[PDB]
Scaffold this motif. Structure first.
Motif, PDB file in Angstrom:
ATOM      1  N   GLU A   1       0.809  -1.206   0.000  1.00  0.00           N
ATOM      2  CA  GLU A   1       0.000   0.000   0.000  1.00  0.00           C
ATOM      3  C   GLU A   1       0.842   1.256   0.000  1.00  0.00           C
ATOM      4  O   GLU A   1       1.838   1.370   0.716  1.00  0.00           O
ATOM      5  N   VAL A   2       0.413   2.192  -0.812  1.00  0.00           N
ATOM      6  CA  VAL A   2       0.989   3.519  -0.837  1.00  0.00           C
ATOM      7  C   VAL A   2       0.004   4.501  -0.242  1.00  0.00           C
ATOM      8  O   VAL A   2      -1.209   4.386  -0.443  1.00  0.00           O
ATOM      9  N   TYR A   3       0.519   5.452   0.499  1.00  0.00           N
ATOM     10  CA  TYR A   3      -0.324   6.340   1.264  1.00  0.00           C
ATOM     11  C   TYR A   3      -0.142   7.760   0.767  1.00  0.00           C
ATOM     12  O   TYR A   3       0.966   8.306   0.777  1.00  0.00           O
ATOM     13  N   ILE A   4      -1.248   8.342   0.340  1.00  0.00           N
ATOM     14  CA  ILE A   4      -1.276   9.706  -0.136  1.00  0.00           C
ATOM     15  C   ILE A   4      -1.751  10.608   0.979  1.00  0.00           C
ATOM     16  O   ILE A   4      -2.941  10.650   1.302  1.00  0.00           O
TER      17      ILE A   4
ATOM     18  N   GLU B   1      -9.447   5.862   2.491  1.00  0.00           N
ATOM     19  CA  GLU B   1      -9.944   5.454   1.236  1.00  0.00           C
ATOM     20  C   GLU B   1      -8.895   5.924   0.250  1.00  0.00           C
ATOM     21  O   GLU B   1      -8.925   5.582  -0.925  1.00  0.00           O
ATOM     22  N   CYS B   2      -8.029   6.847   0.749  1.00  0.00           N
ATOM     23  CA  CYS B   2      -6.975   7.425  -0.058  1.00  0.00           C
ATOM     24  C   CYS B   2      -5.912   6.378  -0.426  1.00  0.00           C
ATOM     25  O   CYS B   2      -5.058   6.618  -1.275  1.00  0.00           O
ATOM     26  N   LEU B   3      -5.986   5.219   0.222  1.00  0.00           N
ATOM     27  CA  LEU B   3      -4.976   4.183   0.087  1.00  0.00           C
ATOM     28  C   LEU B   3      -5.200   3.379  -1.170  1.00  0.00           C
ATOM     29  O   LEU B   3      -6.290   2.841  -1.394  1.00  0.00           O
ATOM     30  N   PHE B   4      -4.175   3.287  -1.988  1.00  0.00           N
ATOM     31  CA  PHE B   4      -4.252   2.454  -3.159  1.00  0.00           C
ATOM     32  C   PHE B   4      -3.053   1.509  -3.179  1.00  0.00           C
ATOM     33  O   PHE B   4      -2.062   1.741  -2.485  1.00  0.00           O
TER      34      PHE B   4
ATOM     35  N   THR C   1       2.176   2.319 -11.149  1.00  0.00           N
ATOM     36  CA  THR C   1       0.763   2.140 -11.378  1.00  0.00           C
ATOM     37  C   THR C   1       0.033   2.161 -10.037  1.00  0.00           C
ATOM     38  O   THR C   1       0.658   1.973  -8.997  1.00  0.00           O
ATOM     39  N   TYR C   2      -1.268   2.399 -10.047  1.00  0.00           N
ATOM     40  CA  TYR C   2      -2.044   2.368  -8.817  1.00  0.00           C
ATOM     41  C   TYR C   2      -3.286   1.504  -8.988  1.00  0.00           C
ATOM     42  O   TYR C   2      -3.954   1.552 -10.018  1.00  0.00           O
ATOM     43  N   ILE C   3      -3.563   0.700  -7.981  1.00  0.00           N
ATOM     44  CA  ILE C   3      -4.761  -0.104  -7.922  1.00  0.00           C
ATOM     45  C   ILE C   3      -5.655   0.513  -6.889  1.00  0.00           C
ATOM     46  O   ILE C   3      -5.172   0.999  -5.876  1.00  0.00           O
TER      47      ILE C   3
END
Length: 133
Positions: free
Chosen positions: A46-49, A75-78, A89-91
């Motif tokens: 997970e990447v956190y914005i 919900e920002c987590l993709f 890329t982001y899922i």
């Protein structure tokens, strides 16, 4: 100076910045400080914005249209997918269960699940922070 990374999307020359209108979308601006989002990979996969000062209070809704201004919930987590030649890329880890893609229009508008998949090359993005060179 290492700091919050920038939202690079494949080239229509924009930078994705937050507005109080419920958006973080691309406009070409590095003249002010709206484009700085703190993007780490905090948990496995997970990447956190997270916002620095203006960097994004993102909320993924329906898992298709992702808009953010007031609060950054998770919900920002993709989920981050690593393409080779060093593209990212982001899922959409909201509905990650259905394999739906996070795709953004920096050169457009806030990110759009109707084409999140290889419909658009706006699903190809790079995370470029200010670097200490």
């Amino acid at each position: 100076y290492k700091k919050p990374k920038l939202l690079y999307c494949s080239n229509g020359g924009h930078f994705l910045r937050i507005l109080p209108d419920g958006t973080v979308d691309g406009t070409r601006d590095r003249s002010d400080q709206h484009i700085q989002l703190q993007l780490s990979a905090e948990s496995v996969g997970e990447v956190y914005i997270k916002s620095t000062e203006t960097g994004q209070y993102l909320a993924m809704d329906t898992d298709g249209l992702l808009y953010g201004s007031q609060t950054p919930n998770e919900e920002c987590l993709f989920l981050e997918r690593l393409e080779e030649n060093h593209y990212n890329t982001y899922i959409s880890k909201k509905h990650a269960e259905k394999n739906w893609f996070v795709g953004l229009k920096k050169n457009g508008s806030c990110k759009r699940g109707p084409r999140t998949h290889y419909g658009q090359k706006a699903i190809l993005f790079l995370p470029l922070p200010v670097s200490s060179d």
